Design a protein around this ligand. Sequence first.
Ligand SMILES: Fc1ccc(Cn2cnc3ccccc32)cc1
Ligand SMILES: Fc1ccc(Cn2cnc3ccccc32)cc1
Ligand SMILES: Fc1ccc(Cn2cnc3ccccc32)cc1
Ligand SMILES: Fc1ccc(Cn2cnc3ccccc32)cc1
Lengths: 164, 164
Amino acid sequence: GGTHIDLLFHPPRAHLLTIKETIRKMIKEARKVIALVMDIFTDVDIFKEIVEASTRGVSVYILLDESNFNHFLNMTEKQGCSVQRLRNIRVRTVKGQDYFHGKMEQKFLLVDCQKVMYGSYSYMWSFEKAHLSMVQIITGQLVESFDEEFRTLYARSCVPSSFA
Amino acid sequence: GGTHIDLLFHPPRAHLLTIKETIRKMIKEARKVIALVMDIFTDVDIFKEIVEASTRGVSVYILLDESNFNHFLNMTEKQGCSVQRLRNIRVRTVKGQDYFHGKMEQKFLLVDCQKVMYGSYSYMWSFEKAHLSMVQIITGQLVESFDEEFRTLYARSCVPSSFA
Ligand SMILES: Fc1ccc(Cn2cnc3ccccc32)cc1
Ligand SMILES: Fc1ccc(Cn2cnc3ccccc32)cc1
Ligand SMILES: Fc1ccc(Cn2cnc3ccccc32)cc1
Ligand SMILES: Fc1ccc(Cn2cnc3ccccc32)cc1
């Protein structure tokens, strides 16, 4: 029981799918649980995929950096898709130490305790159109460490102010 | 010939050294080559460690995101340590597509083609004092993929404007 890792790139290099298509595919194929940790989440296509997973019965847990959470909120309002009236999705924020706002600079997508996407790709249009990035697709034993990290971050997260 | 990965955290969790102490240690123990890919590099302690490696005879290659390269330049000026009169260090910039500046959102430290630190820790004071982050220490076969990525990024890099 070891670990397997493949690298994907943006723009793509020697693989067939873009990182975004891979994210959308990983979400489409979720059966049970999506755990997501993200610094900025404004990408509407990835959001729609997540909402769709939630309607299928997949439990979705999202931890967002506090300082950027408004951008996600704005986007869900645009999409006419309040995350509070979506039963299967739960969202909390994570912050670092203030001095200047400290941030959660972590991101990864952890699906069905089976597969992780970890890297520098944030869920924003600029990462499709403008930025160079890279991710790892991880399976095997190291996925349990991402599971543990997700739980550790959740334990230090807060209910976003917005939410009543 | 497989791959080994350990995780480090900031703030630290179940390991003795901080990520920064680990970065400084990895640089101290470099024998031959440092290859560094960084989005923002303003941390003076890590810089001093790199300069010191260079004086020992270690070849140092640094690829920085173009849009933030001025912050690195500013810092080297403050430190009275021009990277152009340092024989063993070479620095080029990498950019993404413009629309709004596209960025190289990649970072990793690759020492002696043996060990990689990959994760969300940027070489700035805020990552010591303020932000939550995580890295992987990688050895074994996957290190060759970081070597290849470093070379691919170098091939798409430019001489920084500043430099004559
Ligand atoms: F492992 C866990 C799985 C679910 C919860 C409960 N929960 C509620 N909202 C959440 C947001 C992000 C993450 C978790 C969340 C706790 C731990
Ligand atoms: F799959 C794609 C392949 C190429 C592009 C457009 N493009 C070309 N070079 C790029 C560098 C960074 C970011 C985007 C880039 C978008 C999607
Ligand atoms: F693998 C390579 C190792 C060194 C060079 C030559 N070079 C000169 N400046 C550099 C900056 C960053 C990286 C490389 C650099 C090319 C390829
Ligand atoms: F090794 C260290 C251990 C703790 C601190 C100070 N601190 C405490 N909690 C933090 C969260 C995010 C960032 C810094 C933090 C600095 C260095």
